[model samples]
Each structure stands twice: as structure tokens, then as C-alpha cells.
Target: TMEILRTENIVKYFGEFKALDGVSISVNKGDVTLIIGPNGSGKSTLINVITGFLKADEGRVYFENKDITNKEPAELYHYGIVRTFQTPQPLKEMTVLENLLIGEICPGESPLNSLFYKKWIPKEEEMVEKAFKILEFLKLSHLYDRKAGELSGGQMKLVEIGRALMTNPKMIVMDEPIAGVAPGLAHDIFNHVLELKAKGITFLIIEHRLDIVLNYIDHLYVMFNGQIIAEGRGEEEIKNVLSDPKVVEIYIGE
Candidate 1:
């Protein structure tokens, strides 16, 4: 399989504590890979290091075969690896469509060298059309004109995903994309993810709802105490993963 993003023995330390201890996980192109673990398993910490939010004490990160280690989030964005926060950060005052439009404000989204509007406007219009289509795909087209802050929690998450889609990213990193969302709404959200995956958009998601999520993932990476204890890919017999000694022990802190 063509690998899109991967980390090599990533290590992150906070003072005396190691937040991420030699954690390494890779995402294959066009597959929905998942990173799952109990609390304090370094899942989010790994993402932060990958995005350059925190400098790793040791190790490397690669995207599409390029060495992206120690690159800031903006630099990584230019490489088409984008990530969303655990909490949705919509432009509270802007309409959903307007929020989607602002994704172009980022560096890589603009090819005119910067955010200047001469070339940006026509490009913006083109992206606007794409944005509308994304809204429809995420089932948020009806709320296109609604203020972002006014949407429900799940709808706002959909808005975030739609906004990210406007960037035309190769891989999207989602931290808890369904946390606090109702099961029905979560299903709707994952349906969008699956549809996007089919369209060649890869996703690396961190979620806790395995009962629902396990049914859809193409690959799985399980973490425990800041390290991956188990991993499975593409139709591997993982029916008893949670019952594995290491996985169960970590989850229960035995």
C-alpha cells in the first residue's frame, strides 16, 4: 500500500514525564486508519508532535515520502497534511459558507504566493463552488447560510470537516471527530468520512466509540501508556482485539 503519513519512533517529553514514548504509527493512502487508546495514552500528543505544535525530544515524521520532521503546522499544511482540533473551532460569527471560504486564508490554500485578493478572488470563487458541493456532501448544504455558532455540536463538526475539505488536503487528521455527538449524528458523520475516503481523501482519526467505529475502519492502531501495543490492517481478524492481554491490561490499568 502507498503510505501517506507515518511517524518513526516519535518521542515527546514534558519536563520529566514522557508524553509520547517512542510512539510510531503510519497511515496508508486512501484508507481510514484509526488511533485508539485509553486516556493518557499519548494519542493527541502524537498528533501535536506530528503537526509541530510540540517539538519531539526524539524521532522523525514523514508525509508522502518527504521528511516533515520538526516542521510547523503551516509548513505541514503546505504539504497537504491538515489536522482539526478535538474541539470544533468554527468562526462563531461567520455563516457556515463564510467559514468554509476562509480556509483559503491559510498559506498553501493560496498559490498566488500569499493571501492577496487579486488572484485570490477568482480562485476564491472557484473554491466557493467547491465549498458548496462539500456542504452538500457532508449533508450541511441546508445550513449553508446559518451562522456557525448556531449549529448543533455535530453539525458544527460537520462544518469543520467541510471547511477542511475546502483545502483539498491529501490527508486529514481528526482528533475525536465524534466526541459528544449523538450516535445517530455520529453515524451520519462517519458516513461522510467513508464517502470522502472513497473519493481518495485519507483520514487518521482518534475516536473512542469502537462499537460503532470498529465496523468501518480500514486499519487500526491501538495505544497504551504512550505506546502502540497492537495494530491491525485491512480485514485482519481483530474481533478479539480488546480482549488481548496488553490491550485489556492497559485499559484497566492492571
Candidate 2:
């Protein structure tokens, strides 16, 4: 498999606090990698650094073998990398369909070209069409014209996922995507994740609901303190790692 993203000896700090220490990980194309750890284990900090939301104090991040440690988040979009916040930040006043249309206007996609129903309209229309498709996939299409603020927690999450898809990113970093959703909706969200993975888009998800997400993840990385404690493929392998005496003492309560 081809490595699409990699981080080497990454370290991050805030004042005297070390958020990440000598952390390293790799993500291959088409893989659904999950980052799991107890609270304050540097999971979000690691992702923030990787996505260029925060700079690492030491180490390098590479995308397709090119250095990207210093690049801006907007720059990563061109490289087919995108990230989502733990909280959905949709434009509250915008209608669901209208919000998705804004996603279609990414850096290169234009709305003027879409409104006049020009030749590019089809391309733009395709994005809107795909947005509706995603909404339908999440069973939220009926609310397409509703205001984002009016939606429930689960509905907002679905919209966030849909908005990210508008860029057709090669890889997406999700931070506790199912955090506030209902159990049924959480399952639906993970199913949508798998559906996208089958389409060749890779995912790096930070989730706390191991019981729900474990079966769907293709690989796992376990973190403790500020470093990775173990990593492997499959649930059994990861379970063994989590069961390690030291790992259990540090991350999982005894």
C-alpha cells in the first residue's frame, strides 16, 4: 500500500506542558486509521499539528513524501487533506442546502458560475447533488432547506460530514465525530464513514466510543501521555495492545 501521510518524531508544547512527545505515525491510502486513548493523551493535539492547526515544536509531517509540517490548513486542501472539528461549525443562518452550496465553493469552485446555470453549472450541480446524496445517506435530506441551527445534534454532525465531502478530500481527519450523536445516529455516521472509505478516501478518526468504532477501523494507534504506546491492524491486535500491563495502567483503568 502507498503511504499518503506520515509524521516523524513529532513534538508539541504549550508553555511548560508537553502535548506530544516523539510521536510518529503513518497513514496509507484507503485505510481507516483510528487514534484511541484516554483523555489528555495528546490525541487532539497530535491531530491539530498534523492538520496545521498548530505547529509541532519538533518533527516533520509528510504528505505523499512531500514536507507539509509548515503548510497552512488551506494549503492542505490542495493536497487532498481536510479536517473537521469536534464541534460542527456550520453557518447557522444558512439553509442546509445553501450551507452545502458554500462547501461547493471551496477555493476553486465558484458560485457565480453556478447561479447562471452555465456549463460549469453541471459540475457545481454535481456537488450539490452529492451533498443531497450524503444527506439522504444520513437520512437528513428532508431537512435540506431548514436552517442549520434548527437541526438536532445528530443532524448537525451529519451536515458537518457532508460539508467535508464537498471537497472530495483524499483523506479526512475527524475529531470525535460521533461525540454528541444518538446511538442510532452514531452507527449511521460510522456506516457513512465506511461507505466513503470504500470509495478510496482515507480517514483518521479520534473517537472515544471504542465499543462502537472498533469494529469499523482498519488499523489502530494507541497513545499514552504524549507518545504512542502501540499500533497494529485489526481489533484483536489492538485489544492485545490495550491489554498490555503498562498500557492498561496508563490508559485503561485497571
Candidate 3:
């Protein structure tokens, strides 16, 4: 696979505190990369920088060889990069399909276009069809008309993932996707990721359930004190990193 995204010497600081210390990483086309670490290791901060929610103090970010280090989230959407929060944030008053429509019409389907092209009709139909298909894939089609607020935690996470799909993005950055969900539903979600992977969508997952995520991730990067301490593939590779005396000392005490 080809390289789709790369971060070089990325750094971020909050006043006197350094959040990311010259971290560099890359994601190839169709690769499922997992960023794992103990709490406050800069996982979320990295995601925020990549998605342009936070600006990097130094270094650059490249998407398909295009520099997008300081671009806003809306601009990043044009490059087909999207991210989801650890917590699902749906438009509570909207129907499930309606919320998904917002994502579908994100870039070019604005209010101004609604007046000129009367774009809502066709776009709405297209988005509804696409949302229903995603819901069907997740077996949540029955909730299509229901208000988003009524859905359970796991269901909301599924819906949020479905909403991100409406953009037809090449890659998705998911933050702690399995958090706050039941075990069975978490398994289902990860299985859904695998199924999507078969279709060539790349994923960067930030997860705490190392045992579950390790089995599926194609590559792994472990961070400590806002820097990558180790990265490699396979169970044994990750195991070695996990058991490293320094890693254990930092995370679990010697």
C-alpha cells in the first residue's frame, strides 16, 4: 500500500507542558493503525492535531503529499479525512437518518446551495438511502426514524460511525471506540471495522482495550510522556513493547 498520511517531527505544548514531543508517524493506504498508551500519553492530542482541531507547535502534516498541518477541520474534510470523538456527539433532536444527512451534505451541500440548486431534495434522498444502507449493515435500520437521543450508548457509537461514512472518506480516526459500550457490542463494532477494512477503508483507532484491539490492528504505536517509545507489528512485537521494563515502570510501576 502507498502512504496516505504522514506526520513529521510533530510537537504541541500547553503553556509550560509539552503534550507531543516531536512525534512522527505514518499511515499507509488501507492500513489499520492503532495508537495505544496509558492515560495522558498524548493519544487524544495527536488525534486532535491530525484532524486540525488543535494546531501543532512545530513540524508538518501531510495528506497524500499535500501539506495540511494548519488547516481547519472543515478544510481537512475536503481531503477526505474525518475523525470521531471518544464520546458520540449526535444532534439530539434529529432523527438518525437526519444526523447522517448532515455529514453527507457537509462540503458542498450548504444552505446557500439549497437556495440556488434546490439541492436538498436529491441530496436528502441520496443521504437517506446511504444512511439506511449503513444502518442495515450495522443491523440498526429499525432505528432510522427514531430520535438520536433515544438510542443507547453502543447504538449511538454505531450511528456516529455510520454518520462519518456518509462522506465516503478514505480514512477515519476513531478515538476509544469501544469505551462505555457493552462487551458484545464492542465485539460487534470491531467486527464491523474488519468488514469495512475488507472494502479498503483505512482506520486509525485509539483504544484502551489492548487485548481486543491488538488482535485486529495491522500496526501499533505505543506512546509514553507524549513520545512514541515503540512501534511494531504482530502480537509478539506488541507484547515485547508492553513488557519492556521502562514501559512497565512508567505505566504500572516497576
Candidate 4:
């Protein structure tokens, strides 16, 4: 099977600190992939480099086997890479529907399109219908009209995913998608991730709580000191993942 996203010996530096040092990981299409490590272990840094928010000092990023290194964040969408923030920042004043609307709205609306609806109105309607389906798919159909700011942390996170889905991405990089969410909601979020995976979406998730997620993901990559120390796959490898000394050492104090 081909990987949906791959990085080759990625490296990054902030002043004298090397945030990512020869880190590489592959995310298979239609699976949940996780990057877990203690704080300051370069999870976010790798995400920034992958998403084009930060340029890597060295290495390459390949999406669908195409070299996408340093491609503008906005341009990656052409290859179906979209990400959700660790903390979902919604369009607070906007309704949930409006929030999802922005995903498809994107760069489609230009300075010229603003004055006319003849071309955009039909496309806009199509997007609205798709947004509703996505809302329903995420089980948030009832909240479409609610203000984003009115949502709970978990709901907001779901909405954020919904908004990203509005773009119909092939892979999503989610940072702490369930962090701070209630235990049940967190589980719900993971369940949704699995559901999405089943439908051919790939996820590269960054998370702190591995207790529940450990058993759910298809592949796991463990990081420490800005490098990938271990990786394993499937339920059978969960034990291997848990018992690896490198993984154990990274979380020893915490």
C-alpha cells in the first residue's frame, strides 16, 4: 500500500536548537497514525514542517509520492493535506454551518466574486449541502446553526474536524484532537477518528494521552529528542510499543 504522506530525514532549527533532527514517518492511506512524545519532543515542530507553516532546514516531504517540501500551506490542499490545530480556533461569531462553509469557501471567493452571486451561488449551495452531510457524519447535525463560541471544547473540536472535512482532505494532521475533552468525549473523538479511517481518511495525530489512543491507531511512531525512536503497527504491536525501552524512557518521569 502506498503512504498518503511521507517525510524523509526532516530537520529544523530554531536558533541553536534543532527541533527536528532527521525525523521521518510514513502514514498509510486509510489508517490512523500517531506521533507521541513528551513535551518539547518536536511533535509540533514536525507538524509545522509537514504542513508548510515552518520550513525545514533539511529534508523532504512527499504527499502521494510527490515532493511537496516547502510548498505553501495553502498549496498542499491541491494534494488533499489539511490539518486541525491542537486547540480548535473556530470562527466564534459564525454559526457552525458558517464555520464549515469556510472550508469549501477557501480561496474560491475573490475580490471580483464578492460583487456577484451568479457564479458562486450555485457552488455555494453545493457546499452548504456537503457541510450538512459532514455535520451529520460527525453526529453534530443538530448544531449547525449554533454559534461556534457556544460549543463545548469537544464539540468545537468536532466542528474543527468537520470544517477540515469540508475540504475533503485525503490526510489530516491533528494535534491533540481530544486533549482537555471529557473522558467520554475523548473516546467519542477517537471513535470518530476510526470511523473516518474506515472511510479512507488518513490521520497523523499528535496526542499526550496514549492510554486509550494506543489501542486504536493502526500505526504508532514514538519520538524523543527530536527523533523517531520507535514505530510499530496493529493491536499485536501495541504490547511492543508499550514495552519498548526508548518509549518507556521518554515518558519515565512523567
TM-score of each: 0.87, 0.84, 0.87, 0.89
* Tens digit per residue, CA lDDT, model 3, 1-254: 69999999899999999999999999888778888888889999998899877999998999999999988767887898877643233365567776566654443232232224434433456666787888898788889878878988778788778877777778888988886666688788888888888888889888753665556778788887899888877678877776777766666731
Please give the clash total of every predicted structure, in order.
0, 0, 0, 0
State the C-alpha lDDT per candidate: 0.76, 0.77, 0.77, 0.78
Against the true structure, whose lDDT is highest? Answer: 4
Candidates ranked, most accurate by lDDT first: 4, 3, 2, 1
**Most accurate candidate by TM-score:** 4
Instruction: Give the TM-score (vs. native) of candidate 4.
Output: 0.89
lDDT for 204 in candidate 3 is: 86
lDDT tens per residue, model 2, 117-214: 43231246677778788778667889988998898877777777776777778988888887656678778888888988889999998875366666
Per-residue lDDT over 1-254 for candidate 4, one digit per residue giving the tens place of the 0 to 100 score? 87788899999999999999998888889878888888899998998899877998999999988999998657887778887743224366668887676555342222122223223322367788898999999888999889888988788888878867877888888887876666788788888988898888999898863776567888888888899888888877866887877688878777
Model 3 TM-score (2 dp): 0.87
Model 2 lDDT on a 0 to 1 scale: 0.77
- List the pairs of residues colliding in candidate 2: none
Q: Which pairs of residues have clashing backbones in candidate 4?
A: none
lDDT of 1 by residue, 46-103 (tens): 8788876778889989898799999886788888877764323436566788767766
